[PDB]
């Protein structure tokens, strides 16, 4: 329930998203981030519990060229870089 | 599944 505001790179990925505000839940982060890689396609075609997130600003975020939705901790990692806690 | 459903499964824990 605590309301975050996200450092500038992880703003503007939400912002593609379509987030206009500034301030967030981490649900709600979350939220614009599954929109975000829905939006452009970066989960895989066949098994679309993978996210093919190389070569995309969201990968220069997480730090990683894919990850699992059943395996969020690159996520979260990128989530305690990328929020203020308010 | 489709990424929507795995990505709201995800949702619902944070």
Redesign the interface.
């Known amino acids: 329930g605590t309301q975050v505001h996200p450092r500038a790179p992880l703003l503007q990925i939400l912002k593609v998203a379509g987030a206009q505000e500034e301030v967030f839940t981490?649900?709600e982060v979350?939220?614009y981030l599954?929109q975000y890689?829905?939006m452009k396609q970066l989960?895989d075609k066949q098994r679309?519990?993978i996210?093919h997130c190389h070569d995309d600003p969201l990968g220069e975020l997480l730090e990683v060229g894919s990850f699992s939705?059943?395996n969020?901790s690159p996520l979260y990692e990128m989530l305690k870089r990328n929020l203020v806690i308010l | 599944?489709?990424?929507x459903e795995?990505?709201?499964?995800?949702?619902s824990a944070?």
């Open positions: 981490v649900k979350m939220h599954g890689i829905m989960y679309q519990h996210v939705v059943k969020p | 599944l489709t990424f795995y990505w709201a499964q995800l949702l944070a």
